[PDB]
Amino acid sequence: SKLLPGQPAIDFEMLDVEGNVKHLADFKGKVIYIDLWATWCGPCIQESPAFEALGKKYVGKDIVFLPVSTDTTTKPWLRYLDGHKKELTQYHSNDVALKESWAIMYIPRFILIDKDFNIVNAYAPRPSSEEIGTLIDSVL
Amino acid sequence: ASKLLPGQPAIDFEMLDVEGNVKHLADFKGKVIYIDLWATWCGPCIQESPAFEALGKKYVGKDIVFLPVSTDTTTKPWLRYLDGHKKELTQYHSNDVALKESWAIMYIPRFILIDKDFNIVNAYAPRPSSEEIGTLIDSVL
Amino acid sequence: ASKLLPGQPAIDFEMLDVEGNVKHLADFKGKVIYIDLWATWCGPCIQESPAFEALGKKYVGKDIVFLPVSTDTTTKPWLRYLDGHKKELTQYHSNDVALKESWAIMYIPRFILIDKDFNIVNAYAPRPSSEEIGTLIDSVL
Amino acid sequence: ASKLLPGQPAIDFEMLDVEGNVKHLADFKGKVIYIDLWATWCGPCIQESPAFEALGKKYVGKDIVFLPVSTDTTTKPWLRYLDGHKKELTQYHSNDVALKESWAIMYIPRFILIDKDFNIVNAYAPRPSSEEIGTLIDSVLNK
């Protein structure tokens, strides 16, 4: 029951394509919608166009969209990005805190965190879903 | 609205059992409630039905109820489908305007998870076939 | 039926555009045809709409047509839904009895891919949003 | 590619069972073949596991085989996964490059259906949980 709405989020690390290290708590104070995906996962990639459109649509608002590849190694991820260009800042993560503190066994996975850095939904709806817009608006 | 956020109170609505008797969502206050809103022509809905039944089996004796609620426009195709496909769980049907107007049920499949307190856990809950619904349900008990 | 296997001839049906003019599937013979059968209150159908529109745009000028066919019981919600949601591809609607009785379309969403000769490629085709549909379509072109 | 169109010959690949015995897809020529290519961390993949198993039961004794093929990069999580979740069909694992290369399979879940001549029916078959897969299989078993 650590992951239920209202419970605090759990930090993890992520690398960007250049090498900078960011941690989830850097975005403390914004609404955070996280997309976990991987290059060989069809249903994950099917959601990318909608996650990107959300990014564009809320550019002017206090929410951060984190796309985090969980590919085992970095190279299929970078190889994938070279062929499939993206507008949001891309992250990559094989942080053990994802598996052991977030208990993430499967992807796709979507998470919505509110401004106080509390979980709103540990199991958030997909970015292509009709309701995510209102869910997101509600949270702002 | 902000009224469907986690921690907000569930909204009651009326449904009908296969015998044409009224029931209310409120009758279940005190249990964890997982609702499956579905319809006979909806492939994905009908795809989850095996998993929703198996959840009912798997959690027999825990304080949760599984409500399969048809949103078919008329009861006729619902009862026809049920004659040709038997189910362990008690089946319900609803056309209550409150589904569209208080729960913003514009589309199906729609899954909803409500807590023993009759508060929303997730108004857009994961699907019955997912690993995630198990873990989430385990967490609310 | 064995009538829907790849390489078997497609089955014609009637549909209406927004202005009530009639067309038939067979009018498009000679092109690759990708059909999206959907309805206004089908969540997963409408979630594919952006991708289906993106394919139509991506393949403009190539020898393929994209047919968005609403199977809504009546015309009205279809038309209202379109007023709110402007789509680029020409929209159709159909209650032709053949959909159910020849194509065995019992459930939506449903996607169908037909080749230039008007034979079935895949009567249960991948979804518009999938990576798999583009490679499929290119295969066929 | 054009080589994965219905009616084209299927493409062999090597796979291993939980004991390390080797089998090749082409060994099954003569039977309809429905392949489920999945991995332990792909949620949508294992969402289909029950239905795939239900189908192997529904069609026991008929001229079709059901092949669940883990594409996990390593065998350990696969083996660990089956440990804790029991399964009636014989389980297989593959990392044959023929998958990516010749079958041009870049994403899972992925399902393939092959006819008794070892020709492709659908390289992109419906999911096991779907209502149509059973109509499709039956349609292939009659022909």
Ligand SMILES: [Cl-]
């Ligand atoms: Cl949640």
